[PDB]
């Protein structure tokens, strides 16, 4: 009886195995755009993905992860609210059963169709497993998806998903360029938070871009054909794999822009 996104094991249950679910810096949150304060001291984000080395795509039963070689400084996030250098390890998405829901963060209570998470770890902690034990261990770049025009740089991901339909399946996924998933503007909001899945560790500097990317209805429909189940198990579509907004508590969301 493992955690997931169903009636019996969804987000309102997670606190029983992971009491930090009711903690002081949980994610995601609603971004109230009028309450966020412009912080003129925040730096432009530096996203250096030219040498990114993708390896593999995995259906882990909760989402799919596009994994990167993080054994060298090859794809890094720096600047913005961050001290030091954070290395890209993986990206994944959260999405809905309907275009009206799917994102984890909300903007003035608006839900997007999906949300991309580019996960990075602080190189001063040596590896990802040590970094998630630290309050500044991770930096997650969050990008909203809206349904409209196709995102050409997403299509190589969409086309491999038939090969990883079910939990525990993986496929080689080399030479994928995550620069094709970024919007034009790097304007962002930032706050201290957590992983949005168990174990819900409070180790994340969240950086949420203001500008969504557009994907097509056909692209998101292909996400919704994935399965939470393993092969030879009853089919349960991988949809609504998002945690709802959590209380802000004693936190301030800062804006990089006016
Ligand atoms: C649920 N797990 C299992 C992996 C795990 C297990 C033990 C320790 C640490 C990590 C997981 O990988 N979550 C996760 C990881 C990175 C980013 C995000 S998100 N959605 O961007 O906040 C969620
Ligand atoms: Na305002
Ligand atoms: Zn995520």
Structural summary, described in words:
The modification Phosphoserine is found at residues 163, 170. Its cofactor is Zn(2+); Co(2+). Keywords: Acetylation, Cell membrane, Cytoplasm, Disease variant, Lyase, Membrane, Metal-binding, Osteopetrosis, Phosphoprotein, Zinc. The N and C termini lie far apart (47 Å). This protein has one domain (1-258). Strands 2, 3, 4, 5, 6, 7, 9, 10, 11, 12, 13, 14 and 15 form a 13-stranded mixed β-sheet that branches. A two-stranded parallel sheet has the order 1-8. The protein is mainly β and 258 residues long. It is built from three helices and 15 strands. The longest helix is centred in the C-terminal third of the chain and has 7 residues, at 217-223. The chain has helices spanning 128-131, 155-160, 217-223; strands at residues 30-31, 37-38, 45-48, 54-59, 64-68, 76-79, 86-95, 106-107, 114-122, 138-147, 170-172, 188-193, 204-209, 213-215, 254-255. The protein binds 3-(3-methyl-3-phenethylureido)benzenesulfonamide, sodium ion (NA) and zinc ion (ZN). Residues 117, 119, 132, 140, 195-199 line the site of 3-(3-methyl-3-phenethylureido)benzenesulfonamide. 3-(3-methyl-3-phenethylureido)benzenesulfonamide binds at residues 117, 119, 132, 140, 195-199.
């Amino acid at each position: 009886h493992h955690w997931g996104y169903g009636k019996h094991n969804g987000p309102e249950h997670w606190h029983k195995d992971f009491p930090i679910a009711k903690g002081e810096r949980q994610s995601p949150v609603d971004i109230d755009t009028h309450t966020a304060k412009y912080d003129p001291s925040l730096k432009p984000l530096s996203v250096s993905y030219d040498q990114a080395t993708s390896l593999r795509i995995l259906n882990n039963g909760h989402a799919f992860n596009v994994e990167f070689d993080d054994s060298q400084d090859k794809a890094v996030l720096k600047g913005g609210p961050l001290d030091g250098t954070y290395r890209l390890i993986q990206f994944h998405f959260h999405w809905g059963s309907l275009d009206g829901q799917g994102s984890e963060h909300t903007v003035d209570k608006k839900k997007y169709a999906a949300e991309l998470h580019l996960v990075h770890w602080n190189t001063k902690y040596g590896d990802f497993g040590k970094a998630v034990q630290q309050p500044d261990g991770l930096a997650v770049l969050g990008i909203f998806l809206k349904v409209g025009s196709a995102k050409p740089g997403l299509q190589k991901v969409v086309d491999v998903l038939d090969s990883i339909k079910t939990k525990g399946k993986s496929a080689d996924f080399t030479n994928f360029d995550p620069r094709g998933l970024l919007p034009e503007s790097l304007d962002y909001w930032t706050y201290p938070g957590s992983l949005t899945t168990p174990p819900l560790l409070e180790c994340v500097t969240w950086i949420v871009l203001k500008e969504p990317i557009s994907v097509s209805s056909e692209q998101v429909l292909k996400f919704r054909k994935l399965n939470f189940n393993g092969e030879g198990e009853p089919e349960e579509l991988m949809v609504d794999n998002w945690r709802p907004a959590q209380p802000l508590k004693n936190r301030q969301i800062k804006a990089s822009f006016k």
